[model samples]
Target: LTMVSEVQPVSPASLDAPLENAVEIIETVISSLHQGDAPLVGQTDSGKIWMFRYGSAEVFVQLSGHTEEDFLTIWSPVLPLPVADELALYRKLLTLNWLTTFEAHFAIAEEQVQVVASRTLGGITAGEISRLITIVATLADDYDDALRAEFK
Candidate 1:
């Protein structure tokens, strides 16, 4: 399993702010993560974007335009890895109604955060689905909090 993590600070121009209070905000977040007793398993920014990679998983935070309206976006690989006919079939299924259904389910919330699950060529176990859902929920909460802190 490989994971890559990063923290990117966007420029004021990119954020549509000549000099919003985001520098301090971003720095505070980075510093706080390293300051006290937070886990040191990820990378930290040194006045630049911080990046760390491990196996095939990745996590990152990025600063962007409109600090006041900043938000988080999550992405996952499309179903059926190891692209082939099987993957293509899964993608087609996703296009039909699966994607729409999932999006509709997620849209009930005021915030929009997406969690993608790739289809398995082999049958997927119930345990696997449960585990993935749990992970998605956890990450969504984390992202929501982070975005709120940064933007609100």
Candidate 2:
């Protein structure tokens, strides 16, 4: 999901100004997407979890750690685990993780197939956050249909 144009790194000043608050940084990044009216819809677990949508993908951003060390995991459930062909499916996902998924990878977490990407908020820029969110959302949206059609 990482495009060639997205490979550019963020400026040194932005990297030096990492926010202590995870929510604030996440909000700042999402707001820059300019997806008006698509505000964060749900938050729970003491503001450690946020739910939103991008295109056809239902994205979840889960925060971990305290003010000193924050981590962000962006994931979207692609489909339920298939009853048959589990080995083949896992192999396919593994291959895609290496070859196609870029920053986002496929996994079976919490009993469902999902596309996931993670980053430490420390030293992370808004550009990095935007790329992570977009990568996970776009990959999840594409794979939901492609995997379902192939395995279901």
Candidate 3:
């Protein structure tokens, strides 16, 4: 939950910086997160930010701030009707709007942890955001605990 690096704090104003082309930005973010720091999230020139974590899931969290609009944008680039539909379902869950006061929890196997990403539509305090992230890390711990329990 703590920010491990102060390299560049992300903000709406600085979001216009060329991040998509600068692979180091992506790498730094992932490296910081894996090293247990809260990452500075934002948008890129490509209209999407690609988050990659080593041996973890790579996720794209939309920065559009509008669920419906973002979902449509994500859908338009695809072909094959069924694939679009499937993608829609995933997008639906990803874009679910949480109440201004809300929290979400998710679990991913250690190997799959890199793929996790989330989107927020403002209204969350930094403390709340930190707690949500801790929830995810705890979920990962729980998954490991459950596996150990099964062996016993």
Candidate 4:
């Protein structure tokens, strides 16, 4: 969710010279995300990441990337994606992408029908994260109804 103000961007450090300070900056971002109101679901990869179920999205500090980024991903299934309606469903998903904050899309790698939203956690503040929490849960609840109704 875009905020009232352009919630500032993050950086390693502003100083012209510093490697030691970079670690501290990264630590702050991690704490900012994890130490929140949401109910944490589980963790993995040596405890570097954790996820939340229900009201909050799955959150983790993206430590392995080129830069220490963070991600909050949420997902659900697009129930009953039969072969005959794949084309029509895809067309509707394209529209849903723009209409919803949850980057509504599909994944066919393991399963043919999964919907998810991926968020970069680099610069997001608590307020923004809260907005995302609402978005993800609302999408799940509302879309669940819509998806089920369409199945019949």
Candidate 5:
């Protein structure tokens, strides 16, 4: 015997109230996690942007998009761009995205190579948020030093 799961019909205009309240939820979760060490810093963008250091990486959390479809972004810069071997680094980045990382991937932003992760705000739990943040931080911190050493 096998079990099958049913998919619910999609709604066109359903407004997500949880996404609208993402700021408060994120604040509470991060604050609780930040209670001891590693103070949250650089809070700006009307409190939607802030960062903290974990391992060798400084992870930034950002909220963007509309009230009904807010997005939570976490990222860390792995290295500055214009490396000596762009093709090699890009290949490595894509390979890692495909195999090494989960919920995080490589991207170039603001002239820097960064590891990034994101999730839509609605119906996401604190544990999920924490896990994503941890994944980005760990992968970024691990790769930043190695990638810089290899490509610089």
Candidate 6:
């Protein structure tokens, strides 16, 4: 889906600073990811956003409506839980949530487990966004095979 969001210019804390727009923060995220260990997978025609489809992993970075917040969503490699494996899955997710950094955690929506990190509007710098993008790739990789096996 193509989504283009207008970023409101929020005043910087110093007040003397210029307005930092939503597009600016999101763009920096794009700039940073492109320069990082992961390359851009696909971007819309505007180049404002892209869902990362790195060979090693994948994640979604998007602006939510008019909010200053951008979201980093990583899908769990092992998903579509088996009924008998629900309890086991929750236990593993809980353990990962407790141990994972950057507030990345397991959440269920659309019948899948999604790991997400929120970037504050106008606050995120270039470096941190990639970290948010990869939070779950490194997190879920080790457990995917084992979890799927157990779940099966």
Write down the lDDT of every candidate, Cα atoms only. 0.34, 0.75, 0.34, 0.47, 0.76, 0.52
On the 0 to 100 scale, the lDDT of residue 152 in model 1 is: 39
Model 4 weakest lDDT span, ten residues long: 59-68
Q: Give one digit per residue, the lDDT tens place, for model 6 in 1-152.
A: 98658575565566322124444544455454432355344444423445544333455565543344434333443356444868877877787777663457777767666665554545554445446665555554545555567777
Across 8-48, the per-residue lDDT of candidate 1 in tens digits comes to: 55545644232244334434443433323331233334122
In model 4, what is the error at residue 108, expressed in angstroms? 5.1
Indicate the TM-score of model 3.
0.30
What TM-score, over all chains together, does every model reach? 0.25, 0.75, 0.30, 0.51, 0.73, 0.57
lDDT of 6 at 150: 71
The candidate that wins on lDDT is 5
Off by over 4 Å in 4: 1-40, 46-68, 78-80, 101-112
Decreasing TM-score order of the candidates: 2, 5, 6, 4, 3, 1
Better of 1 and 3 by TM-score: 3
Number of backbone collisions per candidate, in order? Answer: 15, 0, 3, 0, 0, 0
lDDT by residue (38-67, candidate 4, tens digit) is 533344552333343332223333222223
Query: Could you tell me which 10 consecutive residues in candidate 6 have the lowest summed lDDT?
Result: 15-24
Better of 3 and 6 by TM-score: 6
Question: Per-residue error at 40 for model 4, in Å?
Answer: 6.5
Model 4 TM: 0.51
Give me candidate 2's TM-score against the actual structure.
0.75
* Candidates 2 and 6 compared by TM-score, better number: 2
Which 10 consecutive positions of candidate 3 have the poorest summed lDDT?
A: 71-80
Model 6, position 74: C-alpha lDDT score: 39
Tell me model 3's lDDT, rounded to 2 decimals. 0.34
Write model 5 residue lDDT over 1-152, tens digit each, in one string.
97657565555886534455666665666665442455564545534686777667777888774353567888889899798999999998999899679889999999999999977666776567777877888898799899988998
